[PDB]
Symmetry: D2
Subunit: 237 residues, 4 copies
């Protein structure tokens, strides 16, 4: 299967998108490092991987704060130690000024810091980076998520910037902007049909498939620095 | 393989992108209708499909002018006759005012006309539409291709519009904007490295993989009305 | 006043935006050519100009079909004859395939044809071109206006393309994408407040001011090839 | 003149864009608060205002660090004290993770913090906010300015977000993305002609005119949340 002999780090993999991505990549033969601050949620991800029939040897669980220098180093050091290399990095991490600081620290700062540390290793394997953004970022307003949206807008710009700089080191960088996603009455179902053209709510697995597509050169090698929107058409309304 | 029991029409399949797409889909198990005005070029596509080991029964060759009402009807009538249904439509068709007229007629008008005719059948199979545009269309200038670019810009808008309207009929619509693609010295290689961040020229197959990705619900169901750029990063420079 | 000793052609000036623009420019001292197919509506524009206290000598009324070669030539020939030169061109001209043809002919084809004819004269005065588009064109869907929207999307691309090509001839090109505009209960007022963030409906004069801004080098010389959205914030929702 | 009886705060007004904007607004009759950390550079701005014939009573000079809570409060408290109200706010403030922190603190954090403090007063006068961004932010890569560009991308998103939220309080918000601007051989002149379609380098005054346009409801009331690019066409290449 694709990703055989590939090693991937998936941040924010203790739930939803990150979790589904880890399970998918693992099932695809990759050697995955899952990480998060909530050990119990993270172990649940590990259990879904094992349940899928994947060997426990292909999973590296790291409980850490990705916003700290030590957490970042631990995430990276344990993956290189156990797997020997790094091929894929899926950056899936993530009102008062205090909320602004916390929001940008997690959604932007930690991604930049972790990525800079991973670059040397990704260059060695001519790896891939997939940044998870959000349609919160786009040519429209997102007042309900003031700081999350601008942090993601910076993530989009960061993706374009790093894609051009890092491709010179054999690294492919792209991003995905998911719309509404659940599974991580009549009135609610009606509104759903109205707000999501697709007529169905997005699923963690739907996003995981797209992440895999972008992490696999066999299927997307010529796609570079693109912001791939996966929102059932919501942002077009 | 994916696309098994699926029927696809690929316009502009007598060369490059269209040809590689037809071969890929056929190899994937789909029943394909290839079409173009140059019979010899089209037969060459058919031969590559056969050479790939695909049964001749899975290929419907239609020599016709996709800009004419009759050509359009022939393309569609022969596919429904031989295959009984239609699941996928890959719209890959495509200075003086005369050049403007010819350019828009082929790149925009014929696509709209063919699509309108296909809609009823695509609705029946909850099919997919993949419109092939170009980075000639985008938030930048493209003076070397005055009419081709604006026609593609209309294709992008048309894609967004139809994606929202047609998803109500179970049809998924998306588009792809390819950058430079070849295979359909030192100075030239240097300039190439400079103009294409990827450092390598795009290949027809690279675009075909992305078309397949978008035509396959298993891999992209939640992607709707998106303009997927596949240009090795060129448009970001 | 600005536009003194300047000559401008305003198409679609028999009503709304075009009419308000003609009155504004005339009041600003420019020598204006108004045009349209409905003579009575056009004369009404002329009367508003005269009522504003502008000399009848500064107004050239041309009743013609801007989609025809003859109409185009008449519009241009009469302006150069009466005024001797051309400084500004405001291109404000503007389902079955038949509706598609009519829509693109007026909204795209005629603009390209007229502009090509005006270029030589605009180069002589280092003039300005202001293309009137619509938020119907943008990174979103516009299903209620299928052909009008794609034609405007092509207008946006055309604006970017010509801005780069024509600036080499001393001509500045930009475009404006107006949102909802009127003046060319409680339930309706409520919905209005909801659909237009501005809380007030756009007015022809609001758009005219922006056209003047872009036609005046003293206020916007460094703005080139930009798509200026004037929609009270509607497209951001 | 426009801006008569209007009070404006212009950050980063000790040089270039900010300085030219302060001089323009002052000459237009507004009561302006200029601010910066370099007292001598700031006084130079004041002197240009006085030299323009403006009364010293219409200028409030505040030497402060706009990134600090105290600087922000001083900037605002002195303007309200001396002028009694606030109508316009022009936010013109503005590799290792350390550089990232410093860059975002100045270009994003301080703007959000200052703006939140100004909002109450801007609501009272149904004021205007003009955020100065950069073409460093856009649908392209900007590798030479890694953190400055992403901070500006967040500024663009922030502008769209606040425009929708604040218009409900009678406040108009927009942003401007300047290209290359100087004045704050043959080989260099050649390259310039090549990199800037306009064929001429942007001037601080060129940007100031656009800021004034957006701060004046008489000329741009219906423009809301728009990212106005003023780059001589550079970003389109």
């Amino acid at each position: 299967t694709r990703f055989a002999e590939k090693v991937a780090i998936i941040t924010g993999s203790s739930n939803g998108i990150g979790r589904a991505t880890a399970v998918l990549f693992a099932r695809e033969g990759a050697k995955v490092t899952i990480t998060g601050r909530h050990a119990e949620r993270l172990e649940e991800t590990r259990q879904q991987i094992l349940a899928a029939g994947v060997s426990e040897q292909n999973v590296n669980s790291v409980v850490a704060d990705v916003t700290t220098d030590a957490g970042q180093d631990e995430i990276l050091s344990t993956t290189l130690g156990k797997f020997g290399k790094l091929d894929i990095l899926v950056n899936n991490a993530g009102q008062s000024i205090e909320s602004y600081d916390a929001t940008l620290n997690l959604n932007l700062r930690s991604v930049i810091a972790l990525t800079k540390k991973a670059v040397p290793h990704l260059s060695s394997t001519k790896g891939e980076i997939v940044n998870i953004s959000s349609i919160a970022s786009g040519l429209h307003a997102t007042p309900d998520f003031p700081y999350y949206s601008i942090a993601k807008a910076a993530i989009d710009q960061y993706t374009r910037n790093t894609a051009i700089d890092l491709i010179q080191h054999g690294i492919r960088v792209n991003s995905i902007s998911p719309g509404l996603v659940a599974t991580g009455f009549y009135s609610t179902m009606a509104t759903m049909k109205e707000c999501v053209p697709a007529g169905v709510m997005g699923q963690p697995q739907d996003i995981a498939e797209v992440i895999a597509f972008l992490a696999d050169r066999k299927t997307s090698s010529y796609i570079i620095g693109h912001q791939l929107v996966v929102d059932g058409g919501s942002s077009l309304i």
